C-alpha cells in the first residue's frame, strides 16, 4: 500500500550522522520492504575509516558533553523527544516499511521511545555520602563510562536505538550506533532529524553492510558495548570485547514460557496468550514461545487459541486492517518454513501451518498441539509466528520443563489466584516474571536476562548504573 | 626463624576441600618460603576431574544453601569469623611463611578477613516494591547468581579468598575457589579449619599447578567468575568466559599515581608516601607506584623520601624487626632485577637499587628520581619495591601524566587544602581517589577499577549486588 510520507522515499538520499554532519557512505545498501519484497530505499554503509571517524568524534565530544551537567543534557533529551513526537507518524511508517510490523505496533514503538526518552531526560544521579565521621569523608560519585558502541537488531530498530540512547546520554556518555543491515531506515532517518538537536559527535550513527559489527565491538576507542541480538552473536561479542576489557551489556533473546494454572479464565488468558505469543510476528526476545496448560484446560484453551490464531488478519503492515505482518527478512522466512515443516512432522497443527501466497515473507500464524517434547521447535528458539501448546500433569513438572532451557529471559504465569501465580512465577529462572500479562517494559523497571540470555539490566537504576562507573573519593581527616 | 605453629608444617598433609571432605590431590606441589627459597610444605594440586567434582558439589549445595535463609547463612558466616579469630596468629604465621610479608602485615590481613566477614555476615538484601498501584504490582527480588568460581592472587592470599567468599555466600551463592599456585598454604589450612563449619559443598577449594585457571573460567558449571590478578590474564579470562556468557568481576591491578600539591606537609606526606608505596614490598594492585611533586617541593620531598626508604629494614617476615620482606616468588624476583636495571638505565637512583646477596628473593627498596617519562618503569606496572618521584610544572600537567596510563585502579592527592585536593582527586581516571592517604579498603565502600584495571565492584552495595541476579515479578491487576 502507499504511504503517508511527506517526501519521496525511493529518491531520498540518506547520510550517516558523524560529528554533526551528514556523511555519504563508502558504499550504499538497498532497503527492501518485507511486505512486498521490493526495494524501497537506499541507505549508506560505512567503511572502517568512517567507523574510526565516528569513534573519534564521540571521544572528542566526550569531555564537553560530560562537563555539561545533568540539567543541560536534560534539555537536549527533551528536544529529541520533541522531534520524536513531531515526526511520530513518519517514523512509525518508516519502521513498518522496513521492519514489516503492523503500523499500529510501530506507533507503539515510537510512543515507547518518547516515554523512555522523557523519563531519562528527567533522571538525576547524585553523589552519595557513604561516610561522614570524625576520621573519614567518603563519597561515591557516578561518572560516565565513556564512548558507548550500541548495536541494535531488526525486530524493534528505532525503539531499541532510543532506549540505548536516552540513558547513555543523560549520564554523560557519547555514542556510536550501528543498526542491523536489514533495518537502517528508521534509525538513519531519526539521526537526520536530530543532527542539530544533539551536540556534534555526542551521537553518531554508521551504516552496516553486514560486516561492521565485529569491528565496532573490538574498537580501541569504544569503552562500553551495548548489544541486542542473538545469543550466538552475543558470545562472539563477549569474546571480541575481551582484549580491550570492555564494559558489556547484552540483550540476547530467549524461550519464554507461559504456564497456565487450573483456575485461569479461558477467554482472558487465551486473549493475552494470542497477543503476546504472536506480537511482532513472534519476533521478540521476550515473546511467549511455549505455553504449558494443565490437563483440565488443554482442550478448551487450545481451541480458543486456534480460533483466535485463525482469526488473525495477515497482510502488509501499512494496511490498517492488518494484525500480523511478514517476518522481517529472507533468512527469517526460510527459518519459518523449516519451523512449519517441523510443526507438521512433530505435532498436530490446529491453526495455520503454511506459507501465504503473497509477494513477501508472509507466514500464516500457526498453532501446534501434541508436540513431541524434544522437537527442535520447542527446544530451540523460534522467531516466527509458529507456536506450541504443551500439556502438563503437575505444577512441578510444568515449572521444571519451563526452566529446562538455556535462556531464562522472561516468563509469565496465568491464573485467577494471584498469590499462587506469584509463587509460581518466582520459581521461573528468568529475569522478569509477568503474571496476568507478558512483555511489559517501562523505564523505571529493570529489564535483563540471566543464564544465556544476557549479562546486565537495561532500564531502571540498575540500568543507569550500567552506563556509569563508580568513582570513590575517600578523605582521611 | 622460628615458627609459632603448634605442629610440623613440613610433614603436614593438606587436602583440598571438596563437598565437605578433604580430598587428596591428583598431584602434589612444593610450597617454598620466599625468605629462604626452600621448600616448607607440600600442598595438593587438582586434576580437571577434581575441578568437575568441586563444581558439581557446589551446584548440589546451591538449592539448599540459598533456601536456608539470610539468618541461618549469617550464623555460618559468623562461625567462620570465629574460626579466623581462634586461629589468628596461626594463619598470620602461615601467610607470612608462604607470602613473605612482615608478620605484622599478616596479622593485619587476618584481622581484615575477620572484619570483612562480620560486616557481610550481617548484610541483608530485601525485596523492593517498584510499583504498588491499582493497575500493577511490581517487586524486585535478588537471587543468587549460582556457583561462583573465585581466583585469587599471591598478594593477600587468605584475605582475598575471604573477601570473595563472605559477600558471595551471604546472598546464597556457592563457591569453588582456586588460590594462586605459589600461595596455597594459608588458604588450604583455613579451608581445613572450616570443612565442618561450612555446610558441605557450599565452599570448595582446589589446588592449582598452573593450569587450572583457564579450566575454571570456562567451566560449564560456573555461572560467575570473580578474578583478581594480572591484566593480561584478565583479558584472557574475559575471552574464555565468552562462550558461556559468564557473569564477571575482574580486579586487575594498576599504576596508582600520587599527586602532591604545593601546600603539602613534607614530613607527613613523606611518611604517607613511603608507607603506601612500599607496603607489602610494592606488591599491591593499588600500591603507590608514581609520585608527582611540584617544583617548589621536589628536592625536600625527594630527600625525606630517600631517607625513609633507606631506613627500611629488609629481612625475613617472621623477624619482628623486619619492615620490608622479600618478593613472593622467583619470576617476580626476576622482574624486580629487570626493573633495577631499567632504573639505573633511565633514572637517578637515590636509595637502594640492588638485590641483597642472600638465599631468597630479597630486593633493596629503591627510590628513583629524574626518571625518563617514556621509560617502561613508569609506563608499566612494577610489582616490586622500586618507586619513582617525578617533577611536574603545572597541576594540569600532573593530572594528565597521572592519567596517561592504561590502568586507572586508584590514585591519591596530598595537600593541606582538602577542597582543592578533592577537586584534583576527582580529575583522576580511577576507581578510587584517596585524599591524604592511599590504599584504604573497607567492606561498606566500593572498590573497583576502570580502564584496563577492572570490570566490576568488589565491596559495598555495588559488588554485593554483583553476586546476585535481578528477578522482576510484575503482576497486572
Tab-separated table of N, CA, C and O in Angstrom, chain A residues 54-121:
chain	number	residue	atom	x	y	z
A	54	UNK	N	33.803	8.258	13.330
A	54	UNK	CA	32.705	8.413	14.277
A	54	UNK	C	33.162	8.134	15.713
A	54	UNK	O	32.768	8.841	16.659
A	55	UNK	N	33.997	7.113	15.898
A	55	UNK	CA	34.502	6.851	17.235
A	55	UNK	C	35.314	8.044	17.724
A	55	UNK	O	35.129	8.513	18.854
A	56	UNK	N	36.171	8.601	16.857
A	56	UNK	CA	36.997	9.732	17.258
A	56	UNK	C	36.149	10.945	17.594
A	56	UNK	O	36.445	11.674	18.551
A	57	UNK	N	35.115	11.206	16.788
A	57	UNK	CA	34.219	12.324	17.070
A	57	UNK	C	33.534	12.151	18.421
A	57	UNK	O	33.425	13.113	19.195
A	58	UNK	N	33.065	10.931	18.727
A	58	UNK	CA	32.463	10.697	20.038
A	58	UNK	C	33.466	10.948	21.169
A	58	UNK	O	33.119	11.550	22.193
A	59	UNK	N	34.712	10.490	21.006
A	59	UNK	CA	35.741	10.774	22.004
A	59	UNK	C	35.972	12.278	22.150
A	59	UNK	O	36.041	12.794	23.273
A	60	UNK	N	36.033	13.008	21.029
A	60	UNK	CA	36.242	14.451	21.101
A	60	UNK	C	35.104	15.121	21.862
A	60	UNK	O	35.342	15.991	22.713
A	61	UNK	N	33.860	14.705	21.589
A	61	UNK	CA	32.691	15.292	22.233
A	61	UNK	C	32.545	14.867	23.695
A	61	UNK	O	31.799	15.509	24.441
A	62	UNK	N	33.258	13.824	24.115
A	62	UNK	CA	33.079	13.257	25.453
A	62	UNK	C	33.292	14.232	26.610
A	62	UNK	O	32.424	14.300	27.506
A	63	UNK	N	34.424	14.948	26.698
A	63	UNK	CA	34.650	15.838	27.856
A	63	UNK	C	33.670	16.988	27.941
A	63	UNK	O	33.164	17.274	29.029
A	64	UNK	N	33.377	17.670	26.833
A	64	UNK	CA	32.408	18.750	26.912
A	64	UNK	C	31.018	18.260	27.280
A	64	UNK	O	30.329	18.867	28.114
A	65	UNK	N	30.590	17.149	26.675
A	65	UNK	CA	29.253	16.637	26.951
A	65	UNK	C	29.140	16.220	28.407
A	65	UNK	O	28.142	16.532	29.077
A	66	UNK	N	30.165	15.525	28.925
A	66	UNK	CA	30.133	15.137	30.330
A	66	UNK	C	30.190	16.354	31.245
A	66	UNK	O	29.524	16.389	32.283
A	67	UNK	N	30.969	17.369	30.883
A	67	UNK	CA	31.059	18.544	31.746
A	67	UNK	C	29.774	19.345	31.729
A	67	UNK	O	29.540	20.136	32.644
A	68	UNK	N	28.946	19.154	30.704
A	68	UNK	CA	27.732	19.949	30.559
A	68	UNK	C	26.822	19.839	31.779
A	68	UNK	O	26.134	20.802	32.130
A	69	UNK	N	26.759	18.672	32.411
A	69	UNK	CA	25.897	18.560	33.571
A	69	UNK	C	24.506	18.006	33.244
A	69	UNK	O	24.006	18.102	32.119
A	70	UNK	N	23.844	17.481	34.285
A	70	UNK	CA	22.563	16.802	34.109
A	70	UNK	C	21.488	17.733	33.588
A	70	UNK	O	20.745	17.381	32.666
A	71	UNK	N	21.415	18.936	34.134
A	71	UNK	CA	20.335	19.836	33.768
A	71	UNK	C	20.391	20.231	32.296
A	71	UNK	O	19.352	20.336	31.636
A	72	UNK	N	21.585	20.454	31.760
A	72	UNK	CA	21.666	20.952	30.392
A	72	UNK	C	21.593	19.830	29.354
A	72	UNK	O	21.039	20.041	28.265
A	73	UNK	N	22.102	18.632	29.689
A	73	UNK	CA	21.890	17.454	28.859
A	73	UNK	C	20.409	17.092	28.822
A	73	UNK	O	19.890	16.596	27.807
A	74	UNK	N	19.713	17.377	29.916
A	74	UNK	CA	18.278	17.138	30.007
A	74	UNK	C	17.521	17.895	28.913
A	74	UNK	O	16.577	17.351	28.304
A	75	UNK	N	17.915	19.153	28.650
A	75	UNK	CA	17.233	19.912	27.605
A	75	UNK	C	17.397	19.245	26.242
A	75	UNK	O	16.459	19.223	25.430
A	76	UNK	N	18.588	18.697	25.980
A	76	UNK	CA	18.848	18.009	24.724
A	76	UNK	C	17.980	16.746	24.591
A	76	UNK	O	17.439	16.462	23.512
A	77	UNK	N	17.850	15.954	25.662
A	77	UNK	CA	16.978	14.773	25.577
A	77	UNK	C	15.519	15.171	25.352
A	77	UNK	O	14.798	14.518	24.590
A	78	UNK	N	15.064	16.233	26.019
A	78	UNK	CA	13.699	16.691	25.811
A	78	UNK	C	13.487	17.146	24.379
A	78	UNK	O	12.436	16.887	23.782
A	79	UNK	N	14.480	17.822	23.811
A	79	UNK	CA	14.388	18.227	22.422
A	79	UNK	C	14.315	17.013	21.502
A	79	UNK	O	13.586	17.026	20.498
A	80	UNK	N	15.068	15.953	21.817
A	80	UNK	CA	14.998	14.740	20.997
A	80	UNK	C	13.606	14.119	21.080
A	80	UNK	O	13.033	13.688	20.070
A	81	UNK	N	13.039	14.068	22.286
A	81	UNK	CA	11.686	13.548	22.432
A	81	UNK	C	10.681	14.410	21.672
A	81	UNK	O	9.709	13.891	21.105
A	82	UNK	N	10.887	15.732	21.655
A	82	UNK	CA	10.000	16.598	20.878
A	82	UNK	C	10.072	16.271	19.397
A	82	UNK	O	9.045	16.196	18.715
A	83	UNK	N	11.282	16.072	18.881
A	83	UNK	CA	11.402	15.710	17.482
A	83	UNK	C	10.700	14.384	17.220
A	83	UNK	O	10.057	14.200	16.177
A	84	UNK	N	10.794	13.445	18.170
A	84	UNK	CA	10.090	12.178	18.004
A	84	UNK	C	8.588	12.402	17.930
A	84	UNK	O	7.919	11.908	17.011
A	85	UNK	N	8.052	13.219	18.835
A	85	UNK	CA	6.617	13.476	18.821
A	85	UNK	C	6.180	14.140	17.516
A	85	UNK	O	5.176	13.749	16.917
A	86	UNK	N	6.958	15.104	17.033
A	86	UNK	CA	6.614	15.849	15.829
A	86	UNK	C	6.609	14.975	14.569
A	86	UNK	O	5.951	15.324	13.582
A	87	UNK	N	7.434	13.927	14.529
A	87	UNK	CA	7.546	13.037	13.379
A	87	UNK	C	7.085	11.622	13.730
A	87	UNK	O	7.496	10.648	13.099
A	88	UNK	N	6.218	11.516	14.737
A	88	UNK	CA	5.739	10.234	15.246
A	88	UNK	C	5.171	9.346	14.121
A	88	UNK	O	5.613	8.204	13.925
A	89	UNK	N	4.211	9.857	13.350
A	89	UNK	CA	3.643	9.035	12.285
A	89	UNK	C	4.673	8.728	11.201
A	89	UNK	O	4.706	7.619	10.660
A	90	UNK	N	5.516	9.698	10.859
A	90	UNK	CA	6.525	9.464	9.836
A	90	UNK	C	7.449	8.321	10.231
A	90	UNK	O	7.672	7.376	9.458
A	91	UNK	N	7.993	8.394	11.448
A	91	UNK	CA	8.918	7.375	11.906
A	91	UNK	C	8.226	6.034	12.026
A	91	UNK	O	8.822	5.001	11.699
A	92	UNK	N	6.960	6.027	12.464
A	92	UNK	CA	6.246	4.756	12.531
A	92	UNK	C	6.068	4.143	11.138
A	92	UNK	O	6.309	2.938	10.956
A	93	UNK	N	5.691	4.960	10.136
A	93	UNK	CA	5.584	4.456	8.762
A	93	UNK	C	6.911	3.883	8.290
A	93	UNK	O	6.941	2.819	7.657
A	94	UNK	N	8.021	4.596	8.562
A	94	UNK	CA	9.325	4.120	8.114
A	94	UNK	C	9.654	2.781	8.761
A	94	UNK	O	10.189	1.868	8.103
A	95	UNK	N	9.278	2.626	10.037
A	95	UNK	CA	9.545	1.379	10.743
A	95	UNK	C	8.703	0.232	10.185
A	95	UNK	O	9.219	-0.868	9.952
A	96	UNK	N	7.430	0.487	9.883
A	96	UNK	CA	6.628	-0.552	9.246
A	96	UNK	C	7.198	-0.911	7.878
A	96	UNK	O	7.263	-2.090	7.509
A	97	UNK	N	7.659	0.087	7.133
A	97	UNK	CA	8.120	-0.162	5.773
A	97	UNK	C	9.331	-1.076	5.748
A	97	UNK	O	9.417	-1.985	4.912
A	98	UNK	N	10.276	-0.871	6.659
A	98	UNK	CA	11.465	-1.721	6.592
A	98	UNK	C	11.383	-2.950	7.481
A	98	UNK	O	11.947	-3.989	7.139
A	99	UNK	N	10.786	-2.831	8.660
A	99	UNK	CA	10.682	-3.967	9.571
A	99	UNK	C	9.492	-4.883	9.241
A	99	UNK	O	9.569	-6.103	9.424
A	100	UNK	N	8.370	-4.323	8.803
A	100	UNK	CA	7.219	-5.112	8.404
A	100	UNK	C	6.117	-5.237	9.431
A	100	UNK	O	5.098	-5.864	9.140
A	101	UNK	N	6.256	-4.633	10.601
A	101	UNK	CA	5.223	-4.838	11.596
A	101	UNK	C	4.002	-3.971	11.299
A	101	UNK	O	4.086	-2.977	10.564
A	102	UNK	N	2.849	-4.324	11.871
A	102	UNK	CA	1.648	-3.514	11.657
A	102	UNK	C	1.868	-2.076	12.101
A	102	UNK	O	2.469	-1.806	13.149
A	103	UNK	N	1.285	-1.158	11.330
A	103	UNK	CA	1.511	0.266	11.537
A	103	UNK	C	1.196	0.676	12.974
A	103	UNK	O	1.840	1.583	13.529
A	104	UNK	N	0.198	0.042	13.588
A	104	UNK	CA	-0.096	0.304	14.989
A	104	UNK	C	1.007	-0.141	15.933
A	104	UNK	O	1.318	0.554	16.914
A	105	UNK	N	1.601	-1.315	15.678
A	105	UNK	CA	2.712	-1.746	16.524
A	105	UNK	C	3.879	-0.770	16.400
A	105	UNK	O	4.549	-0.446	17.386
A	106	UNK	N	4.107	-0.255	15.197
A	106	UNK	CA	5.147	0.739	15.005
A	106	UNK	C	4.822	2.034	15.760
A	106	UNK	O	5.720	2.674	16.338
A	107	UNK	N	3.544	2.445	15.759
A	107	UNK	CA	3.180	3.643	16.508
A	107	UNK	C	3.487	3.453	17.979
A	107	UNK	O	3.950	4.382	18.657
A	108	UNK	N	3.221	2.253	18.496
A	108	UNK	CA	3.591	1.952	19.879
A	108	UNK	C	5.105	2.036	20.079
A	108	UNK	O	5.574	2.506	21.117
A	109	UNK	N	5.887	1.599	19.093
A	109	UNK	CA	7.346	1.722	19.205
A	109	UNK	C	7.766	3.187	19.384
A	109	UNK	O	8.563	3.523	20.267
A	110	UNK	N	7.205	4.078	18.569
A	110	UNK	CA	7.588	5.485	18.657
A	110	UNK	C	7.137	6.066	19.993
A	110	UNK	O	7.871	6.833	20.638
A	111	UNK	N	5.935	5.685	20.449
A	111	UNK	CA	5.447	6.174	21.734
A	111	UNK	C	6.347	5.723	22.871
A	111	UNK	O	6.643	6.486	23.793
A	112	UNK	N	6.769	4.470	22.821
A	112	UNK	CA	7.675	3.925	23.814
A	112	UNK	C	8.985	4.678	23.826
A	112	UNK	O	9.507	5.008	24.888
A	113	UNK	N	9.536	4.949	22.648
A	113	UNK	CA	10.757	5.736	22.584
A	113	UNK	C	10.556	7.083	23.265
A	113	UNK	O	11.411	7.531	24.043
A	114	UNK	N	9.436	7.754	22.966
A	114	UNK	CA	9.217	9.080	23.524
A	114	UNK	C	9.172	9.014	25.040
A	114	UNK	O	9.761	9.855	25.741
A	115	UNK	N	8.500	7.998	25.574
A	115	UNK	CA	8.344	7.937	27.020
A	115	UNK	C	9.634	7.522	27.715
A	115	UNK	O	9.977	8.084	28.769
A	116	UNK	N	10.384	6.582	27.135
A	116	UNK	CA	11.687	6.269	27.708
A	116	UNK	C	12.590	7.508	27.685
A	116	UNK	O	13.287	7.817	28.666
A	117	UNK	N	12.552	8.255	26.582
A	117	UNK	CA	13.397	9.429	26.432
A	117	UNK	C	13.060	10.491	27.472
A	117	UNK	O	13.960	11.077	28.082
A	118	UNK	N	11.764	10.760	27.681
A	118	UNK	CA	11.375	11.766	28.669
A	118	UNK	C	11.708	11.309	30.084
A	118	UNK	O	12.217	12.096	30.901
A	119	UNK	N	11.465	10.036	30.388
A	119	UNK	CA	11.792	9.544	31.717
A	119	UNK	C	13.253	9.790	32.033
A	119	UNK	O	13.579	10.419	33.044
A	120	UNK	N	14.149	9.363	31.136
A	120	UNK	CA	15.569	9.543	31.411
A	120	UNK	C	16.000	10.996	31.259
A	120	UNK	O	17.004	11.395	31.856
A	121	UNK	N	15.263	11.797	30.485
A	121	UNK	CA	15.554	13.221	30.433
A	121	UNK	C	15.406	13.841	31.809
A	121	UNK	O	16.066	14.838	32.120
